Design a protein around this ligand. Structure first.
Ligand SMILES: C[As](C)(=O)[O-]
Ligand SMILES: [Ca+2]
Ligand SMILES: [Ca+2]
Ligand SMILES: [Mg+2]
Ligand SMILES: [Mn+2]
Length: 770
């Protein structure tokens, strides 16, 4: 794997240390303490956090007199260091909050025993080590924070003892970081952030500069390769949150101790979580991941002066605050832990210290749909409403593969709608990384909503290069994007030679922002077998021929609902019912029906119509009108007829009421059988019932609402060159102006068409008179 050629980010590696240690300083100074003691009374959230912290069993439990041996279970050794680190931090905190003598004595005894026992006899390169770098990252931050909080009350003797213990763990992490983490995944970044905290705690130690520098260098190798600049984390949502356990404390520590503020440079990793949230605030079960909440409330306070494309006026802080509190937390009841570190972490304390009760929750007010083309995730989203069954969400996954925690999911999608998880990613595993079923099923192409060619998954053209996106369009009535992947490209494990050369171009559309069309073009230099898989998540599958229905019940993930799907072309494909595991969280795996549609072909097409429905909704009437060169059909839903057409080439062809040379076309009628909305990919003409709607002198991609005879409105996808576009006016109606991107463009009217030269895409209004 090339760790240097992904478009990630990095920060300065210059170690910045204050002139003299101050304790406390990691989270707050001496002067802050009484405000932090009083913080419990601000709102119901601070009150709940205070009730949890002040009743922690770590305040009352016997400090264990039994030190484990190197030959005890990895579980017991892990829990020993976890428990001792938690005794230190909880007791140190409650001493600052209350002044109770017992809390200082307990914090002091735990710190004097920090990293006693067999830890330095053990080998963290042994898989499942009880002292793995991922756990001691949390232990280091827990013990360092306890020391920061108790240091002013220690005897000179106890200070020297406890410093020597913290300094030894810092030296051992510094010396072994790159041996323990020879690949720059979360096993490198987490203990790097731990080392950072230790260096900032012991800023007067002679080696603190060396420690902090290596910490920053090591963390940068992770943020350069596993993160995109746009904030996407390539190990998935679960290992993102796992990383945040050490990253979020380190960011505050470095700002608070040295004045180095990295919150601006890390901003995108938090905005990313809000961009990909489903209607209940869950990050997707993509790569080795479960559904996750994103703890954006713990950094909201740092973004009060940061602009976001998620709101016309509000700052990022208010959107980060909105996102966390508009999450369904029931999948983490009754315990409440979503960090992945529930033996080690002090999440209640860290929340109590980071949460800002003065930040108003403001729902994003922009278009739901977002294109993150640098990483390659797109979300089609009707609205930002929380737990509303009228919402529709589709994630379109097209991320360059990383060499850790990877699933074969190129050009796959998941749907969240009617308050239920529908079209599915199969998830991480049954329980864990090491299960055989993860390799034989969960990571495999067939476990995803993809098309394989002779069983080969769609993949990257080259290592660390995002699959190309095109024809991005966002309107009130129709959204669109296509993504391109190859069959004979780059993957993990590495495969250099193929018996053929081929590619998939997948277009997704969002008709009426109400349902989905998935339109595939497939090109190969040879006859191959194309297998299309459609997984309906945790639903009962019914249906025959090209039609499948998945029926959901009230479960841990959503409400009773159903998802109806049709596949074209009916007459050129066979439909195979299969069964596969779908899992959203550790331990909750079950088997459900999925569809395998199959063609043997060289160049061909598929189309899916996928409709979220409430429990008792009518099934739409869907008719396949596919022929030799043309794939598509009609959908009659809620008394309106939509038409979808795809072809491989720019040739004049017809399907239902559409005639076009476009490689994709969408039309929507009203109740009254009048054309209301249309879109084309690379058309020079469209007729509807034999009436010309538009012509152009060169291929153009756009979407237009013609429902308002005083103003046609839509968007034109990005343009390579100048196109002369001619749109038919309502009969007998003049044009008054044409606006593209807030600017008048020159127009003429010829034979009842508005004629414009367009040199750039964007939003278009054609304003008519009477
Ligand atoms: C699957 As075919 C190219 O025979 O329509
Ligand atoms: Ca993947
Ligand atoms: Ca839209
Ligand atoms: Mg390791
Ligand atoms: Mn997967």
């Amino acid at each position: 794997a090339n760790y240097e050629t992904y478009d990630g980010f990095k920060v300065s590696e210059e170690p910045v240390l204050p002139e003299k240690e101050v304790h406390p300083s990691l989270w707050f100074t001496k002067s802050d303490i009484q405000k932090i003691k009083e913080k419990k009374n601000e709102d119901s959230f601070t009150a709940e956090l205070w009730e949890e912290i002040s009743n922690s069993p770590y305040l009352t439990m016997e400090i264990p007199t039994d030190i484990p041996s190197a030959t005890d279970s990895d579980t017991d050794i892990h829990k020993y260091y976890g428990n001792m680190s938690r005794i230190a931090k909880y007791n140190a905190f409650m001493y600052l909050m209350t002044g109770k003598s017992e809390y200082r004595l307990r914090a002091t005894e735990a710190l004097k025993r920090a990293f006693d026992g067999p830890i330095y006899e053990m080998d963290p390169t042994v898989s499942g080590s009880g002292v793995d770098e991922i756990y001691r990252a949390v232990w280091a931050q827990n013990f360092a924070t306890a020391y920061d909080w108790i240091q002013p009350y220690l005897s000179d003797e106890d200070d020297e003892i406890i410093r020597e213990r913290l300094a030894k763990e810092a030296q051992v992490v510094y010396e072994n970081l790159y041996t323990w983490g020879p690949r720059p995944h979360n096993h490198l970044s987490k203990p790097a952030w731990g080392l950072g905290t230790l260096a900032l705690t012991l800023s007067d130690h002679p080696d603190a500069s060396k420690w902090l520098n290596r910490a920053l260098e090591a963390a940068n190798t992770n943020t350069l390769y596993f993160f995109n600049k746009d904030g996407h984390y390539r190990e998935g949502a679960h290992y993102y949150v796992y990383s945040l356990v050490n990253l979020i404390p380190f960011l505050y520590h470095y700002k608070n101790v040295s004045g180095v503020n990295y919150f601006p440079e890390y901003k995108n990793i938090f905005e990313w979580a809000v961009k990909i949230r489903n209607g209940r605030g869950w990050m997707p079960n993509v790569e080795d991941s479960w559904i996750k909440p994103a703890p954006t409330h713990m950094v909201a306070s740092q973004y009060k002066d940061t602009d976001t494309d998620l709101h016309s006026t509000a700052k990022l802080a208010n959107i980060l605050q909105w996102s966390y509190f508009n999450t369904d937390f029931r999948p983490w009841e009754p315990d409440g832990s979503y960090t992945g570190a529930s033996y080690d972490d002090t999440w209640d304390i860290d929340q109590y210290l980071t949460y800002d009760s003065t930040i108003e929750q403001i729902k994003p007010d922009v278009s739901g749909t977002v294109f993150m083309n640098n990483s390659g995730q797109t979300v089609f989203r009707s609205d930002w409403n929380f737990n509303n069954p009228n919402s529709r969400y589709l994630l379109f996954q097209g991320v360059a593969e990383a060499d850790n925690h990877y699933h074969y999911d190129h050009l796959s999608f998941i749907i969240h709608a009617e308050n239920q998880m529908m079209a599915s990613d199969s998830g991480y595993s049954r329980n864990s990384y090491g299960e055989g079923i993860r390799t034989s099923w969960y990571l495999t192409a067939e476990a995803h909503n993809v098309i394989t060619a002779n069983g080969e998954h769609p993949k990257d053209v080259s290592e660390n290069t995002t699959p190309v996106s095109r024809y991005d369009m966002d309107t009130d009535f129709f959204d669109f994007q296509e993504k391109e992947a190859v069959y004979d490209g780059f993957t993990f494990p590495e495969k250099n030679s193929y018996d053929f050369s081929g590619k998939q171009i997948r277009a997704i559309g969002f008709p009426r922002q109400d349902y989905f069309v998935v339109a595939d073009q497939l090109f190969s230099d040879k006859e191959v077998q194309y297998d299309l898989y459609l997984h309906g998540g945790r639903g009962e599958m019914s249906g025959e021929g090209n039609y499948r229905l998945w029926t959901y019940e009230d479960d841990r993930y959503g409400q009773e609902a159903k998802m109806a799907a049709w596949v074209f072309p009916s007459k050129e494909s066979i439909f195979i019912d299969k069964e596969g595991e779908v899992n959203y969280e550790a331990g909750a795996f079950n088997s459900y029906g999925y569809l395998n549609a199959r063609q043997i072909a060289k160049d061909t097409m598929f189309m899916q119509i996928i409709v979220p429905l409430s429990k008792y909704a009518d099934i739409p009437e869907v008719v396949d009108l596919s022929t030799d060169d043309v794939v598509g059909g009609t959908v009659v839903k809620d008394n309106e007829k939509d038409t979808f057409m795809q072809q491989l080439n720019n040739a004049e062809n017809s399907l239902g009421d559409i005639t076009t040379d476009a490689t994709f076309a969408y039309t929507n009628e009203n109740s009254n059988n009048e054309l209301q909305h249309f879109s084309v990919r690379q058309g020079t003409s469209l007729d509807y019932k034999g009436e010309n709607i538009f012509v152009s002198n060169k291929p153009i991609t756009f979407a237009l609402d013609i429902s308002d005879e005083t103003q046609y409105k839509g968007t034109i996808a990005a343009l390579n060159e100048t196109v002369e576009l001619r749109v038919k006016n309502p009969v007998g109606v003049p044009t008054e102006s044409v606006v593209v991107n807030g600017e008048n463009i020159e127009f003429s009217v010829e034979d009842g068409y508005t004629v414009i030269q367009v040199a750039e895409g964007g939003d278009i209004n054609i304003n008519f008179g009477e």
